[PDB]
């Protein structure tokens, strides 16, 4: 039933905030927390993301966290800042100067106990907590380092609940910070062991979409985020509206994750303009519309979820989704039959008359980790910048472990890509 939301750090709280802005809209929830919608399908499964406070007020079951207060006052000052439960703001001061170690072990650990207090407040309330979804970046220090701390702290208290993450992979084309290839490989080392399902949001892809496809002369962060919110509303449509397929976090993980480690998804959205069903379908299976910087035709699809939103012909969606599997038959592994599923939601997303959201576990996602590991080993072969971490008491071995462990994951993707039937 209920999901508990956690956003953490600069990126985490930005994309987190926009996510709520957007679905609050879809469910007809205003910045004060009242309902002013037309359809009853809106409040059908509102409990998944909202609590019903006194005075029929809907309140995002969402916890905001940071080590600098900068980003969070921007949020409370934002369009929707008041909708949030003020108690669920939990920000430190000592900050983390984009040091993963400061979020994980040192600067983050004094605050970790106070975040967890707020989680328990929201979890004890749940009629039936299915699990948690997290928003954060893997380049920073708070969202990256303290987010991965938090997951581990929540898991050992809720080990049979589902752990879901929208993780933002760092690209040079968006942040000139030099230590990002370290932060990422360190948190990815945590993600493979401690999350059940992880949506890979790649900035190289978000920039390139904006510059190449959207012709944004200079793309802003809000420009990138407008894609992220479209995606997030897209991949959670089945969680939030009365539907059949993947209606809860567990049933999605069961359909999407054939092997516990390989749970890193390549989300897709169409139309990407920011319009026909055969067009939507082709687009959402096209490289350009991928929110991770990968050509899926450079690997094979283990599993795929497609969600078509808007008023359209379901026979047509059916015939088209069969079309693209037949024509692209080679790109779907033989040994998992019927690995592609299709949802259809009446309610179009705000603005569009119909969209298509794609979610794929492809071995082409190995392309994304390889890029991080080239950026990582290049800096680490020389032991560069390692004082910022060892300073915080860490160990150089814990980098190797994080290196070699991340290299195992890529093999595993290549293993199953190269597997056959009989």
């Amino acid at each position: 039933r209920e999901i508990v939301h956690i956003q953490a750090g600069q990126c985490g709280n930005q994309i987190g905030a926009k996510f709520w802005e957007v679905i609050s809209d879809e469910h007809g929830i205003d910045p004060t927390g009242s309902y002013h919608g037309d359809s009853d399908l809106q409040l059908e499964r509102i409990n998944v993301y909202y609590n019903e406070a006194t005075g029929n007020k809907y309140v995002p079951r969402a916890i905001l966290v940071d080590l600098e207060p900068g980003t969070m006052d921007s949020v409370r000052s934002g369009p929707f800042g008041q909708i949030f439960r003020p108690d669920n703001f939990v920000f430190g001061q000592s900050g983390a100067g984009n040091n993963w170690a400061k979020g994980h072990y040192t600067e983050g650990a004094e605050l970790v106990d106070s975040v967890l207090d707020v989680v328990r407040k929201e979890s004890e309330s749940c009629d039936c907590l299915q699990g948690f979804q997290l928003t954060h970046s893997l380049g920073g220090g708070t969202g990256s380092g303290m987010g991965t701390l938090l997951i581990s702290k929540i898991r050992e208290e809720y080990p049979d609940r589902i752990m879901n993450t929208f993780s933002v992979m760092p690209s040079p084309k968006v942040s000139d910070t030099v230590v990002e290839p370290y932060n990422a490989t360190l948190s990815v080392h945590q993600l493979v062991e401690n999350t059940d399902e992880t949506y890979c949001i790649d900035n190289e892809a978000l920039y390139d979409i904006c510059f190449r496809t959207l012709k944004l002369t200079t793309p802003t962060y809000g420009d990138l985020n407008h894609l992220v919110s479209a995606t997030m509303s897209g991949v959670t449509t089945c969680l939030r509206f009365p539907g059949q397929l993947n209606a809860d976090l567990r049933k999605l993980a069961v359909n999407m994750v054939p092997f516990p480690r390989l749970h890193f998804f390549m989300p897709g959205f169409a139309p990407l303009t920011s319009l026909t069903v055969p067009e939507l379908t082709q687009q959402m299976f096209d490289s350009k519309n991928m929110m991770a910087a990968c050509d899926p035709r450079h690997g094979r699809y283990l599993t795929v979820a497609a969600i078509f939103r808007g008023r359209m012909s379901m026979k047509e969606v059916d015939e088209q989704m069969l079309n693209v599997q037949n024509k692209n038959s080679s790109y779907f592994v033989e040994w998992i039959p019927n690995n592609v599923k299709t949802a259809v939601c009446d309610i179009p997303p705000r603005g569009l008359k119909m969209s298509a959201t794609f979610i794929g576990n492809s071995t082409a996602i190995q392309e994304l980790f390889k890029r991080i590991s080239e950026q990582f080993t290049a800096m680490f072969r020389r032991k560069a910048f390692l004082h910022w971490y060892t300073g915080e008491g860490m160990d150089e071995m814990e980098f190797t472990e994080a290196e070699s462990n991340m290299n195992d994951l890529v093999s595993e993707y290549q293993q199953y890509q190269d597997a056959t039937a009989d």
Binding site: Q14, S74, K173, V174, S175, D176, N203, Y207, T218, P219, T220, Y221, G222, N225
Partner: peptide, 5 residues
């Protein structure tokens, strides 16, 4: 690179 929400 110059990239503000």
């Amino acid at each position: 690179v110059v990239x503000x929400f």
